[PDB]
């Protein structure tokens, strides 16, 4: 089997991407944030504290003839950005782009943090990291991909995120029309539960490539590119007037600037992030100070190849017995 679904930016900055997901019988379609940095499929629901729901579409398990309460199971998650959610668990039928999993754990939120409430466009998350990170207790549950894998034509999914435009998540096949050149595959460590890999270096603009190992995670659920302070300083030094602002929470730059590209290495291959992908617009409405899309990972504890990096590539998440990651230009 295979599946193919369009993923759409939630706003004009590509702050996140939403993908429609069918849950239950009859189908209830919710728009979920596919997150290769976490491993829970959780949704706003009829059980979510009413004051914490503001415009989201909810899953109502009592209206699904295939929903079953997973007795005694609870979940609770905290994300790198400080947001969180928790609740109980149903199993139900879940379909993405024509690919169907029966008995998928659907984690129903009883509580969500303010950041989730305040974002009316995201109805929940669909985790695509390794199932070892799943938070369901006392019996850990499998991700949608893990459940689907054996049925797929090939045990893979691909992320093809757009810049200021829709893109695609495919399951079970590689669309050879969706990228240019070849896909370069690179080793993955699953030791921390992430799609963790080592970039071979970087360049800023038309500058020389610096060969250096950068361990980080391919994370579709993180907006920006978080890299070591040395790398980030070298990038922003090429933008007149750019500075790190403790008050704003990262590098800012004059909105009048033209940003240089940023290249990262995948083995001997190179992925080029155009400068415009690194512009996250005014820090507040009407400001001429703009927020940068490349930020320091210092104090995160891990480097994160988030959407800024991934959307410059066609990315293969290869869930073979020994997982790997593939990157192609597009």
Swiss-Prot record:
Intrachain S-S bonds: 255-290
Any GO BP annotation: proteolysis
Protein name: Endothiapepsin
Active-site annotation: 35, 199
Alphabetically ordered keywords of this record: Aspartyl protease, Disulfide bond, Hydrolase, Protease, Signal, Zymogen
Residues of the full protein shown: 90 to 419 of 419
Single Gene Ontology MF annotation: aspartic-type endopeptidase activity
EC number annotated for this UniProt entry: 3.4.23.22
Protein's organism: Cryphonectria parasitica (Chestnut blight fungus)
Ranges for domain Peptidase A1: 17-328
Protein family (similarity comment): Belongs to the peptidase A1 family.
Catalysed reactions, as listed in the record: Hydrolysis of proteins with specificity similar to that of pepsin A, prefers hydrophobic residues at P1 and P1', but does not cleave 14-Ala-|-Leu-15 in the B chain of insulin or Z-Glu-Tyr. Clots milk
